């Protein structure tokens, strides 16, 4: 009940961090709680008492990854546009035009506010350290992880960061 939603779309409001090594060659990824083999980035729900998205982003990066660092860029917003739960059993799932197909119009599940963080430390004891793994990946590896995880919005956020892409 401490969760915050868009007053317009009803999307859950979430913040998180693209956590880069100081040399900008790697990004910190974490395993999903539900799916141990899916690698994503730290992010979670804004809570009602939190004054800004940076606070949520750095809290969730601590809770989920045991990562501390400095926010160095605002990477703006991305949206989880996965269709609702009922979607694949509904009668009209797609809206087609002359040269294009789209999933039927729906609000986003989640609106993510992403920041780029420069990693200053990784701690062995952190709140979710027995529920998740946290590991550095090159850009090429991280991109494949996020496609494997079916989270293109997280890849959109990563691509806005200063991560070195030509591995
Ligand atoms: Cl909003
Ligand atoms: Mg979360």
Residue numbers in the entry: 21 to 187
Quote from the publication.
Our analysis provided very interesting results: First, three mutants show prominent increases in thermal stability in the free state (K63A, R171S, and Δnose) as compared to the wild type. Both basic residues are very close to each other and other positive charges. Therefore, it seems that removing the positive charges relieves the tension in this highly electropositive active site, especially those for Lys63, the mutation of which apparently increased the thermal stability by almost 12°C. As mentioned, Lys63 is not conserved in HsDIPPs; however, it is conserved in MsMutT1 enzyme. Although ScDDP1 failed to crystallize in the absence of ligands or analogs, the stabilized ScDDP1-K63A allowed us to solve the structure of DDP1 in the unbound form, revealing that no important structural changes are seen in the active site upon binding beyond minor side chain accommodations of a few basic residues. A retreat from the active site of the mobile Ser-loop (52-SSA) involved in phosphate binding is also observed in this mutant. Some kind of activity decrease is in concordance with a less efficient polyphosphate binding being more evident in the case of K63A mutant.
